[PDB]
Every structure is written in C-alpha cells, then in structure tokens.
Design a protein around this ligand. Structure first.
Ligand SMILES: CCCCCCCC/C=C\CCCCCCCC(=O)OC[C@H](COP(=O)(O)OCC[N+](C)(C)C)OC(=O)CCCCCCC/C=C\CCCCCCCC
Ligand SMILES: CCCCCCCC/C=C\CCCCCCCC(=O)OC[C@H](COP(=O)(O)OCC[N+](C)(C)C)OC(=O)CCCCCCC/C=C\CCCCCCCC
Ligand SMILES: CCCCCCCC/C=C\CCCCCCCC(=O)OC[C@H](COP(=O)(O)OCC[N+](C)(C)C)OC(=O)CCCCCCC/C=C\CCCCCCCC
Ligand SMILES: CCCCCCCC/C=C\CCCCCCCC(=O)OC[C@H](COP(=O)(O)OCC[N+](C)(C)C)OC(=O)CCCCCCC/C=C\CCCCCCCC
Ligand SMILES: CCCCCCCC/C=C\CCCCCCCC(=O)OC[C@H](COP(=O)(O)OCC[N+](C)(C)C)OC(=O)CCCCCCC/C=C\CCCCCCCC
Ligand SMILES: CCCCCCCC/C=C\CCCCCCCC(=O)OC[C@H](COP(=O)(O)OCC[N+](C)(C)C)OC(=O)CCCCCCC/C=C\CCCCCCCC
Ligand SMILES: CCCCCCCC/C=C\CCCCCCCC(=O)OC[C@H](COP(=O)(O)OCC[N+](C)(C)C)OC(=O)CCCCCCC/C=C\CCCCCCCC
Ligand SMILES: Nc1ncnc2c1ncn2[C@@H]1O[C@@H]2COP(=O)(O)O[C@H]2[C@H]1O
Ligand SMILES: Nc1ncnc2c1ncn2[C@@H]1O[C@@H]2COP(=O)(O)O[C@H]2[C@H]1O
Lengths: 406, 406, 406, 406
C-alpha cells in the first residue's frame, strides 16, 4: 500500500526538521538557502494532519477527534509553521525556541512506526532502535545547544559543531573525558541538566538491552530449567544413571525436534476449528488408511482424530509386549518401529512414517499378538480403547459395522 | 478527602527541610531570615505525628503504637525540633549534623506516597520516580557537604553551590569530568564515599529502569512467544503454509481484539458471582430470545449461561456441515455467519450479532439441516448436547416442556 | 549453637587476612608488630579445616573428602602458613605474591554464609551484599597493588594509601576523574587490567541490583497485570462501567486482604495432611456447630471440610434468591450477610463470622425459603449438594440419620 | 570426534587473523616475517569451507547451499585471500581495509561454538563469554585504528600500542580518564564512533550479566515466593503460629530434599514410557513384595505403579487413626513410621524404607485396625480404594484371586 511510502516520506521530513531546526537556530545564515525544502517540508507536514486522520479513522472506526484528546495533539501543534515565521522575522533567542514545536512530530512518528513495524520486528528491539534514533537526534540538538552557549569565535562552523557533538557524546555516554568542560555558570547549568539527561538516556539504553537479552533465548532457558528440575528430582529419587541418560537424550531429541514445546500444550492454544484443521492435516491419509475405520463418514474420522494423543517412545524401548492386555491403537508419525515375536527371536515387520499398529485391541479384548519395540524415537500417537468406545457410542451404525468385522 | 492535601503539604514541608537544612548548615546567615517558615514547618510537622496516627489507625484497626516498633519511629524522631535548637545556639560542626534528623521524614513520606499513589501509578514507575526524587535531594545534600569541605573563599554563594552541584552530579552519574577534584585528604575520603554512593544510586536507577522496561510490553511478548511456539511446532509437523497463514491471521485477530488473552482463562480469575454477572451481561437478550428456552425461569437461564464456551471460528471455514450428527447449539457474539444449502449453491440466511443457530440439535438427534460457514471471524459461543442434558436434568418440568415442543 | 560464633570468628580472621596481607606486602615494616595476631590468625585458620569438616559431615552424611574434590580445596590450600614463611624470610616481590593464598578462604566463607544466612535474608540481597564486600576487599587489594607500582617517595603511608584507594574507587566505579593516572607502562598495564576488572565488578553490581528490584514487588505486579488483563477483556466484551467498577473493587478487596493470591491455589501447594490441618483450623467450631452435622464422627467432618470451596461474594449482591432450586450450603468466614424476605421488604436475620446458612438444600430438594444478600464482602465457603452426596455415600449410617432428620 | 580439534584449530586461526590483520595494517613491516603462518592460516581457512559444509550437511540432511543464503556467506567471503594480495601489493590505506574480510569468520565461529558448547555450558554464560571475547578482539582492532590516526613518531611500537589499548579500554569501559584524547578532527570523529560503540558494548555486557544473575537462583526464588504466598495466605486466615511453623519446616524439608519441586509435576514432564520406567525404578521391590499383589502379572503391577500418588507426611502427625474408614494403602519411600495401638499407649511396629501398610483397606471395608503416625518426614506414596478398584476391573482374574484371599 502506498501509505507506507508516505509514512517513510513523513519520517524523512521529520528527521529533516530534527536536524535543521537546532542547526539553523545556532546558524541563522543556514535558514534562507534551505528555504525551498522548508516550504516543501511544511506543505507536506500540514497535509499529513488530515490525510493520516483518514488512514486511522478507516480502521476500527468509532470516529476520531481532530482538535481534542492527548493523542493527535502532538501532530496538530507540530503542523503549525512556527519555525518559518520565527526564522523569517528573526525573533530573539529566548523566544526563538518555539521553532522546536516541529520536534513534537517525533512522538507521533514513533507511534506510527510502532504499527508500521512490530509485525516483522521484535517489539523490544523496535523500542531499543527507536530509543537509539531519538538519542542521536537529541545528541544533535544538545550539541546545538552547547554551541549556542559557547563564546563567539572565528572557528569554522564544522569544527565547532564537531567539538560540540564530541562533548555531547562524551557526556551522554558517561565516558566523561573532561577535556572540554563548562567555563561559565550558564554552561555549568546546561551541563548539569545534560548530565542528568544523558544518565537517564544511558540507563534507558542499558535497561532496553537487558530487557532484550533477558528474553533472547526464552525457549532454550525454559527447556534447560525443565531438564534441570527433572534431573534433580530423579537424583533425589536415586534413579540409576542409565535411566537418567535415557531421559537426558529424550529431552535432547525433544529440543532438537520441536524446541522443547509440549505437543499437547501447543495444540491447546488453537481454537477448536484450527485444532481440527491441524489434526486433520497431521493425520491425513493415515486415518482413512485404517481397515476397521474405512467406510465410516468423515464426522467419525474428525471425532477420532481430535482424541489421538502424542507419545514419544524412546529408541529401543517397548511399546507393546506380547501377551499383555493391550487396549490402545497406535499411529506412527515421525519414527520407525519393529514388530517382533513374543520371544524377540525374529522380526515380524518394520513399520515407518504413516503406518499404524495395535488395531486388534479396538475390535477385540484378546491379548497382544506380538511385541512392538521402537527402533528410533518413534514420536507416535495413541488411542485408548475406552476413549474409542466413548466416541464410538455416538455412531451406532459404524459400531455395528466394526462388530460385524470382528 | 482533605487528607490528600494535608499529605501534599507535609510532603512540601519535608522537601523544604531537605533543601534548607544542608543549605543553611553551610550558610548560617540563611537561618534567621527563614526562621518564620521554620516555625511554620515545625508546628506542622509535630502536628502530623498524632494526626496521621489517626488516619492509619482508623483503617484495618488493630491499634497502633506511638513510641514503639521500627515503623512510626522515623516520623517520631524526625518530629523533634533538633534543627531549631542546634541552629539557635550555633553548635559546632561535628555535632551540628544532628539537624539532619528532619531528613528521616523522607522514609515515612515515601511510605505514605506508596499508598496515596500506586493506585493510578505503576508501582515500578512509582519506585523509579521516588528514587529519582531522593537522588536529587541527596545530590543537593552532597553538594552542601562538598561546599563544607572546600577552603573558604570570597566566591559568591550561588556560584560555589553551582560548582558543588556540578561536581556531585558529575560524580553520581559516573560521568567524571575531573575538572574539579579533591585537593585535601578529607575531600578525598568524602569523594570516595560519595563515589560509592553515586555508583550505588546509578546502579539503582539502571536496575529500576530495566525492571520497568522488562515488563513494559508483557502482553505483547507473551502473545508473540505463544505465536512463535505454535509456529515452530506446526513447522516441525510439516503443516502446509496456507494453514499456518490461517493460524497466523487468527492469532493476529485475537491480539487486535483482546490482546492475546484466552477467553476461558479471563473468566476464571473472577469468582462465581462475578462470573455469573459478566456472563449474564455478555449473553443478555440473546439467551431468552431462544424459542426453546423462552418461558423457563431465570435459574435455568443462569445455569445455561455459565456453561457456554467461547470459540473463534475463522473467516470462511465451516462451523456446521449438513448431514452430520450435530450436537451443539451456537450463539453469535461479535461476527457474522452465513447459512448455506447442503451443496453451498444457495445461501439460506445471514446471521449477525446476537443471533443464534443450531437449536435443532438440542431438541432432536436429527442430522444437521444445512451448512453454516463463517463470513468474518465469527467469535461465537457453543453449547454441547451432553452438557445441555446434564444441566437440564435438574429442571425436569422444562425438560418435559421442550420434549413437548419437539 | 556455638558454631555460629565460630563462623563469625573465622569470618573476622579472613577479613583480617584480606586487609593485612596486601597492606603488609607493600609495607614490610607492618609485618613484625602484628606477628602475634598472625599466629592467632594462623592457629585458628588451620584449626577450622578439620573442625568445620565435622560440622558439614554430620549433616546429610555420606562421608566427606579432606584432600580431594573442587570443594574443600580452597580451605585446605588457604590453611597453609605461606604468608608467615614468605614474610619471615623476605622473599622478593614476584614470589612474595604467594602470601595471597590466604585470600582463597573468601570463596569458602561466602559458601558458609550462603547457609548461615539465606534463611532470614533474601538470596538476591545476600548475593549483592557478598558482592559488595568482595568489591571493597578487592578495592583494598587493588589500592595496595597500585601503591606497589608507584615510584618510591617520602609521602606518609596514610596519604599514599588514601590516594591509591581514591584511584581504585574512581576506576572500579567507572567515574574516572583522571587526576591521577599511569605514568609508566607497568602502571598502564595494571590500570588496563584493573579497568577491565572494575567494569566487570560494576556490571555485576548493576546486574544484581536489577535482579533484586525486578522481583521486589512480584506480588503487586502479578496482581496488577491480572487486573489489567481482566479489565481489557471486559472492555472488549463491552461490559458496563458499573460491573467493571464492581470487579475493580473486588480485586482491590482481594489484594488488600490476601495480596492477590487465589484461595484455592494456595491450598494446593500444601500436602494432604497439611491441607487437612489448615482446613480444620480455618473451619474449626463452624462445622460441628451445624445441626444436621452434629453427632457424626470426625472422619465425616474431615471429609466434609476438605471439599468446602471458597467464594468471595461482593457487597450488596445476591448469594441466594428465594424460590430458586438451591443446592449449596454456605459458611461465613470473614464477612457478614443479611437474610431477607422473598420481596426484600423485611430482614429476617443478620449473620456474621462463623455462622452458616442454606442447610435445607442438604436435607431436602425444596426451593429456597428466603433471599440471602451480602452486606460486606462475604468471603465465605460453599458446599454443593452433589459433592455432599458423593462424600456422604461412604457414611451410610449418617446418611440414614440425616434422612430421619428430614 | 576429531571434528572438535579441527574446530579448535579453526578458532585459533581466526583469532590469529583478528590479532594480526589490524596489527599489521598499522605495521607493514610485520607482514613479511609472519608470511609462512599466513599461508598456513590461509590454506587451512579455505579448506574449512567445504569440509565443515560436510559436517553440517550430514546432520539433519536436507541439502545445504554453498553460494547462497544469509548463512554460509560470512565463511565464504572470509575464505578469500584478500589480505594476502592487499598486503603483497601494498594497496593504500582507504582500500587496504578490505583485509578485514577475514574478521567475518568470527560470526561463523560464534555460531559453531554455539553448538560445540551450550551442552555443558549455560547459554547465557556462553553468550556473555562470547561477547567478552569479541569485545577484547574489538578493543585490539580499535587500538590499531587509534594508532593509525596518531601523528607519526619515533616511539617504540610496543609503547604506542600500549597507549592505544589503554585509550580504547578507557573508552569502551566508559571510565574516561581523558589523559589522552583526540587532537585532530579525524581523531575526534573516530573517538565519537568508538564512544558510541563502547557504550553499546558496555550496555551489552551489563545486560548479559543482568540476564545471567536474574536467573542464577531460579529454583530458590521460585520456592521462596511460594513460601511467602503460602505464609501470607495463612496469616490472613489467622492460622495459629504452630501450624505455620509446621508448614514452614515442611517447606524447608521439601527444599532441602528436592529443591522445591512438586513431585507430581516433575513426573508430568516425562512421556508415558519414561514415566513408567521411572515409577518402576522408584517402586522396585516394594510392589511385588506386597502379599495381596504377589502372583499377579506385571501388566497389573505396571498399571498399579503409575497411579501411586506422593504425599509427604510431616513428623509426628497422623497418617492413619484407628477406627476410621480407611480406604488407602501406603508405601514408604524415604522416611519411617510407627504403628501404634488405638490408644497410642504401645507401639505395634516400626516401618522404614521400602515397607508398606494399610493393605487391609484394599481387601476389606473394615475400619482401621491401628493408628499409624510419622516419626520423621515419611515421604511416602498412597493408593486409594476407588482407584484400585478402577484399575482392578480390567484384571478380573486377579480380582477374584484377591476376593478369595479375603
Ligand atoms: C529530539 C530531541 C530534542 C532536541 C533538542 C534541541 C535543543 C536545541 C537548542 C537550541 O537550538 O537553542 C539555541 C538557540 C541559539 O540562540 P542564540 O543565542 O545563538 O541567538 O537558542 C539558545 O540560545 C538556547 C540556550 C541554550 C540551551 C538550549 C536548550 C533549549 C531547550 C529546549 C527544550 C526542547
Ligand atoms: C549520520 C552521519 C552524518 C554525517 C554528516 C556530517 C557532514 C555534514 C556537514 C558538513 C561539512 C562541514 C562544513 C564546514 C562549514 C565551515 C564554513 C561555514 O561556516 O559555513 C557553514 C554554514 C554557515 O555557517 O553552516 C553550516 O553548515 C554548519 C555546519 C553543519 C554541519 C554540522 C551539522 C551535522 C548534522 C547532523 C550530523 C549528525 C546528526 C546525528 C543525528
Ligand atoms: C536525602 C538525603 C540525605 C542528605 C545528606 C545531607 C548531607 C549534608 C552535610 C552537611 O550539611 O554538613 C555540612 C556542615 C558544615 O559545617 P561547617 O564546617 O561549615 O561549620 O558540617 C560539615 O562540615 C560536614 C562535614 C562534611 C561531610 C558531610 C557529610 C555528613 C553526613 C551526614 C549523614 C547523613
Ligand atoms: C529544581 C530547580 C531549582 C532551581 C533553584 C536555583 C535558584 C535558587 C537560588 C539562588 C540565586 C543565587 C544566589 C547568589 C547568592 C550570592 C550572595 C550571597 O552570598 O547570599 C546568599 C545567602 C547568604 O550567603 O545564602 C544563599 O542563598 C546561598 C545560595 C542558595 C542557592 C543554592 C541552593 C539551591 C537549592 C536547591 C536547588 C536544586 C535542589 C535539587 C533538589
Ligand atoms: C579479595 C581480593 C583479591 C585481593 C588482591 C590483592 C592484590 C595485592 C597485590 C600486592 O600486594 O602486591 C604488591 C607486592 C609489593 O612488592 P614490592 O615490589 O613493593 O617489593 O608485590 C608487587 O609488586 C605486585 C605487582 C603489582 C601488581 C599487583 C597485582 C598482583 C595480582 C595478584 C593476583 C591475586
Ligand atoms: C572483532 C572486531 C573488528 C575489528 C576492527 C578492526 C579495525 C582496525 C582498523 C585498521 O587497522 O586500519 C588502520 C589502517 C592503517 O593505514 P595507514 O594510514 O597507517 O597506511 O588504515 C587506516 O588508516 C584506518 C583509518 C582509521 C579508522 C579505523 C577504522 C576502520 C573501520 C573498519 C570497519 C571494520
Ligand atoms: C592476552 C594477553 C596478550 C599479551 C601479549 C602482549 C605482548 C606481545 C608483544 C610485544 C612486546 C613489545 C614489542 C616492542 C616493539 C618495539 C620495536 C619495533 O618497533 O618492532 C615491532 C614490530 C615492528 O614495528 O611490530 C610489532 O611487533 C608491534 C608490537 C606488537 C605488540 C602489540 C600487539 C599485541 C596483540 C595482542 C595483545 C592483546 C590483544 C587482546 C585480544
Ligand atoms: N432459512 C433459514 N433461516 C435461518 N436460519 C436457517 C434457515 N435454514 C436453516 N437455518 C439454520 O441453519 C442451521 C443448520 O442446521 P441445524 O439443524 O444446525 O439448524 C439450522 C438452522 O438454525
Ligand atoms: N429467621 C431466620 N433466621 C436466620 N436464618 C434464617 C431465617 N429464616 C431463614 N433463614 C436462612 O435463610 C436461608 C435461605 O433459605 P435456605 O433454604 O437456603 O435456608 C434459609 C435459612 O438458613
């Protein structure tokens, strides 16, 4: 949308004001040669007042003020051509400061950037970058103020501005070389207030950096503290080192795969329709592929899919042991698994991605026919007999169908 | 209440003490011309001791001490007219410091402001502002102490105080120009202790700023990390980009509407009566408007309303598909929805705010008569058949009424 | 226990070492006059090695090393009388530094203080205070090192130590006056390493302060953000201002009473026996006072009490409305409540702390006889009919007793 | 694996580049005598480009780019021998800076260390250490840049490098002695940009330190705030000091044993197979030791074990009181317990680690035969009658067996 390039243009005009206004306050001779752009800067800026008023009124509706409220005032009062008149008639120093009203546009530009950005940019990083930009603009303004109090001299404007910017950076960053310092009480008061301002600005920078880096690896720290808690509890319970190693490597696999997030908790953030869509896409072509499920309507399938629960079986450990009272069908979703004889002397089968096993427990209460043992991290899904019956009761005809299949 | 203006007056008197006491310690000639206000300052301050004792005793009751406990002592010992006597009889320097006992009122004024404010003011911002005020008062006191150690000279009191405040600000902010520095061992020791104090104060400022800005966008970061977790889990599960886009825009709608808060968790903070009131106001004139509900007493309505659960259906996705085994009535609460034929070739109806659909599943087990599909984000509420029966069992007469309606 | 005074004595001896060793390294003449205390310091310190080994071995058992492991080594190698020999034979500078091995006792004293304290002292505040103490000791040591590199001069030892401490404080606090600076390459290298160390130490101070103050009002911020979330969700749902005000004042009452903690979640931290004890003490002499409960054994009472759930009814709102299907007994626990006629034209009763109402719903399904309305914040407890029956089924004889009472 | 020593070698070569390139930029005479190692440095570095491409392609598969993407570019463009050619033909200053392209290897070495480490090293501490290393390398580079702008002089290269490093450390650490400062506009601009960079670097150091120490005792603070909440809620409920003391010591035991972690929540992080393994190892040889359990298959045992719930009975408080309606078997797991007569006048038994009691309630509804009272913190497990029946229903034959045992 072309509103973005307009916002960028308004940002450039605001930066032009922030640079020029204090720079031409100390250098009146700089006013007239840049007068065309100022007109270009002014006609644009006032034009932004109603135009942007449209772009914000047409979202979320509810009418918008144009002469009221704490909001929309910093733009309104910054629209006035106070700078043009005050420079044109050469108003004296203590009243020429009214030219700074253009700088009030900054606190509206920051709000605009808070929604032009902050989709693709971290909000803490966005706040830090806005603070850095404001600090640089303030450093320019403070250098101009420092120049305004220096005794007049024949030094080139460039070198005196460089000295003023050197001093203001030295102060704002609290480095404080002190090679150039106030020589007069007014410079002393200005330096005191600038020292307070610089301490506040550097504290803001440090606080924003800490806020950023304190959450820079939130997932990693959340997983690590979870592992630490689990390991400490196991060590208290005097669990053998081998089982702790198996748990450690399970957590390592879980982190390397899905960054430590619990599978069941992630599919709890989503609403029911989105959970249904996600589950139907995860379990696509693996649930209608079941023989005892085939032929049932998709309202049965969608009810079945929402109740499958994830379970990460580790490598080499048992999922099913023959002769037990098996009561849970399974569906493989990332790993592979081996079906072995009751004595594990021979391998019946190898199953992989999109395959399933344990169907018999759905149709019959018979004990398990064979052992099932994970080769890799199986990363599969489970469905209990009792839940299957509960969700089957609402579909009597397919219950009779599966009873006939038995 | 007039107690607020009294507290503000006591704050002003305490600031007057904090300004004058160290300033007149180095300038004895300043004592006598301000003596009237000191009397005004003193008669007020002692008067605050019992008076405020009332205002705190009449809340939470339980009696209050007046010569005991760590609390209420900083006010008591600060009530004493030590400053008046010590200035009146010109006690020498090492014992004149007892005039500072007025400054103990600050740690009671801060406690008072912690409850006069902190309703309408962020507690972290309140602590930061109190720290800044205390730092400025301490800067004044430290400038006075620095003046007290300077060799006597004919410089105007104003310019020497300005130099002392310049030095103390330069030190407390760790900028350290070093253009003015200790010339004598006593000034060196004072500068060492003031350097430690200033480092501690600036560390406190930075820590408070970090604590503030680390929670300045808690809701935004909590929503963003939730979105990141969901997206990472989806990407691990190899979900298609279009479904991820639909989930992303659902989360965007949820944030723009209710700032990322889960609807069910917010109505869990409230107690049962407040949950009932909030639910009755959300679902007002949308639940008695139901035909199969009309005529039932309000104890049935209030039982029904507490069990409605929220579900945000996304735009263009199905809520009801014809021919299924529908078992859930619905109530629209923000969006709009279209009722379409079983082949979606023609639109039966458009429903909006305060409308409902799916009534049939309450009265009959018949399959759905038509499809229902969200136009916008529907943002609606659902009620299951089984929950409806469970809460209906306690009202047999209206169960018979609805059975007759069928 | 006398072990505390022994630990305090060992702390004092360690501080004596930390002060004297670098101070006498630059001042050899200070060694001999303090030799007695050094013997006193040494005979004690070695004596601490086995003695404390007992005090830690007799807790948690499991045997302890005495010549092994990363732990217990800093104490062992600090026990050696390296300082006494190195000062007695006047070993030259580059090898005299071995006297510093006494300072290794600090990292054991800190560990000891981490368990002598940290019961009654905040762990973050304890870490900050230990850091401050270590920083002051390091400042003394660094001042001694700075003196060691200064060209020899006839200045008094006191004033040169004061200048060195001034410089080291100026550097460690990053203030950096620069009135005294390296004059030689070795002093330059020492200043570089001390600048790195001071930057690290001041960063540690700031980080510890931020960690402390970022959790200084955890309860207040946790309650405030909960209130903000609730209010934002209500405002999205367009709830009337009066209901929002009632919710705001409910949250204010909850904070002022129990600091924002959910009553049900606090009695979830405790184990079953402690939950039972706490509940029996909360509901003492209010549950046997019930007429339809009197005479039952205390195994019935203790089963009843664990199932009472808390509910804070706000002032002026209804708890019971006459003619409804009441199914929940109530017990008042902080507030008061008024029993009013079905038309609220006359007050039947006022009930307060330790009183109860709604008994009839336990014995009979009859509709409520009268309205019950909170005067204050009632802050009471509730018991459902269905839960009462479920916990009654295990006591058939008292069920028959209450059936006879009906 | 030998890949680790190769990564360490590549790290050493990258550090060699970071040290030499800016050092030989200001000292051309240093180029030729180190030319052999440069060849050794270069032939290795290019060799790393495909070789490491293998080591990362053989994990997680999916093919890898070699001329594309933001990743793998900093290594590619750093492989080029720009330094060798630019030094060999003595390209002038403003274009000789292209030799710095070797330094782009740093942002790949950091990524490599992020996975060579971060298993055994805290990620926040790892980030802090990487930042410190980068800051030291940048300090060397900035010292070289400062030397590049100094007017030429006959001072030894060592002492001028020492002065430059002194200045850059003084600036980056914000200490700012100001004994050496820019004398020319170009040095002023360089100092301004270096002041900004140093402020940013020191803010990064402080932020990383705060992020580290704000989570340095997460478990301790999480337990302490839980204790504070519990104690505040108890004090609001006016619970007696003795019960609060018992709760305080229960929490102290819980912290000293398992660091404040809830037993039930830790065995919720693990998946079902790992939960089963951990439970089977915790309850090994204590569940088959039961007489009414012996003889049942291990599918019954494994179903029983998953349902045992932990409960920490405090010292001296009752677990079982005679004559009640006992309905829960128990298993001791850390502590000891005393079985006492119904009048507690005589002790029937003392049971300890691995023992059990309360078996009768499983087989019969008879009231408890004797009292059971904890000596120490019992730290045991419980199993309800109703849960036992629910998990028994799936094994009818052993239900008949236990019915015969009765
Ligand atoms: C984004 C940031 C805010 C930018 C702040 C800009 C301050 C420039 C002050 C200035 O540009 O002011 C100089 C004129 C020269 O006037 P003249 O004496 O050379 O004739 O006026 C003066 O002297 C000013 C007197 C010296 C103190 C300057 C601070 C004025 C504060 C304004 C609040 C904003
Ligand atoms: C981000 C990187 C920015 C880098 C830009 C720096 C270069 C811009 C300018 C100038 C070259 C120096 C001109 C020397 C003037 C001497 C003769 C004179 O006397 O004629 C100057 C006129 C009339 O007097 O007046 C004048 O041009 C006064 C001189 C104006 C130059 C200082 C103002 C620079 C403004 C922003 C720089 C950084 C702001 C950060 C936000
Ligand atoms: C809120 C903040 C606390 C404010 C601290 C006020 C310190 C002013 C010290 C003072 O105002 O003291 C100067 C008199 C002059 O006495 P004189 O020698 O000119 O006759 O006494 C002296 O010299 C004082 C000797 C120089 C050291 C001043 C620090 C005294 C610390 C007090 C603890 C509070
Ligand atoms: C927040 C903004 C505050 C701005 C207020 C600053 C202006 C207040 C004062 C004064 C004008 C300078 C007077 C020059 C005296 C020379 C003649 C003399 O010698 O007669 C001064 C008398 C007797 O000697 O004594 C004296 O008035 C000694 C001079 C007293 C002035 C310094 C004390 C200022 C106190 C607080 C300022 C900031 C505190 C921050 C918290
Ligand atoms: C708790 C904190 C640690 C305390 C650090 C104590 C450092 C004192 C160094 C010292 O007290 O050392 C001075 C002797 C004098 O010897 P002299 O030349 O006057 O005969 O030795 C020297 O010169 C030392 C040469 C100057 C550099 C001192 C730093 C030595 C670092 C030790 C690591 C700990
Ligand atoms: C890890 C960290 C990054 C290390 C940064 C290394 C900067 C060394 C600059 C240099 O080593 O540069 C000196 C040559 C000497 O050349 P020459 O005049 O003595 O003949 O070039 C010059 O003058 C440089 C002009 C002075 C400014 C130096 C900063 C150049 C920035 C590069 C971006 C990276
Ligand atoms: C972590 C601890 C590192 C400690 C290492 C410091 C000692 C290394 C070096 C040297 C002794 C001084 C040589 C004096 C040269 C004077 C004669 C001359 O003029 O011949 C020097 C040649 C040609 O000119 O050129 C040159 O060797 C210029 C001189 C090179 C020495 C400065 C470069 C040091 C590089 C890294 C040190 C710390 C980096 C932190 C990351
Ligand atoms: N003509 C219509 N106008 C409005 N709503 C309709 C119309 N026809 C069907 N519906 C609704 O569409 C719903 C879909 O089938 P249900 O049985 O769920 O209940 C149906 C009605 O509530
Ligand atoms: N005169 C009274 N004095 C005290 N309590 C009363 C009186 N009349 C009614 N109640 C209580 O008011 C309650 C409201 O009806 P319930 O059936 O819930 O049980 C009723 C009694 O507990």
């Amino acid at each position: 949308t072309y509103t973005l390039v307009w916002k960028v243009w308004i940002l450039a005009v605001t930066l032009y004001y922030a640079i020029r206004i204090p720079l031409t306050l100390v250098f009146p001779s700089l006013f007239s040669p840049l007068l065309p752009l100022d007109i270009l800067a002014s006609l644009a800026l006032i034009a932004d007042i109603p135009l942007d008023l449209a772009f914000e009124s047409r979202r979320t509706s509810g009418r918008k003020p144009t002469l009221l409220a704490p909001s929309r005032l910093p733009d309104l009062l910054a629209a006035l051509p106070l700078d043009l008149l005050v420079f044109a008639l050469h108003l004296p120093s203590p009243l020429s400061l009214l030219s700074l009203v253009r700088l009030l546009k900054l606190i509206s530009v920051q709000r605009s950037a808070t929604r032009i950005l902050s989709y693709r940019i971290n909000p803490a990083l966005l706040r830090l970058l806005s603070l850095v930009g404001f600090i640089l603009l303030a450093a320019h303004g403070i250098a101009c103020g420092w120049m305004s109090l220096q005794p007049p001299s024949e030094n080139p404007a460039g070198t005196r501005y460089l000295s003023a910017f050197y001093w203001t950076i030295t102060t704002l960053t609290t480095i404080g070389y002190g090679d150039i310092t106030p020589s007069t009480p007014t410079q002393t008061v200005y330096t005191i207030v600038i020292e307070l301002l610089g301490a506040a600005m550097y504290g803001l920078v440090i606080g924003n950096i800490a806020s950023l880096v304190s959450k820079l690896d939130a997932a990693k720290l959340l997983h690590r503290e979870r592992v630490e808690r689990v390991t400490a509890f196991l060590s208290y319970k005097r669990i053998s080192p081998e089982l702790q190693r198996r748990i450690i490597e399970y957590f390592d696999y879980l982190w390397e795969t899905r960054r430590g997030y619990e599978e069941r908790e992630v599919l709890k953030e989503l609403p029911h329709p989105l959970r249904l869509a996600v589950a139907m896409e995860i379990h696509g072509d693996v649930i209608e592929k079941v023989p005892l499920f085939k032929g049932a309507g998709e309202e049965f399938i969608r009810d079945i899919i929402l109740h499958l629960e994830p379970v990460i079986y580790g490598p080499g450990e048992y999922i099913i042991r023959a002769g037990e009272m098996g009561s849970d069908v399974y569906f493989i979703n990332r790993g592979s698994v081996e079906v072995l004889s009751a004595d594990e002397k021979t391998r019946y089968a190898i199953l992989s991605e999109g395959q399933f096993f344990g169907e018999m427990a759905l149709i019959l209460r018979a004990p398990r026919t064979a052992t099932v043992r994970a080769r890799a991290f199986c990363d599969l899904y489970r469905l209990d007999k009792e839940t299957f019956d509960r969700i089957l009761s609402r579909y009597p005809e397919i219950a009779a169908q599966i009873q006939e299949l038995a």
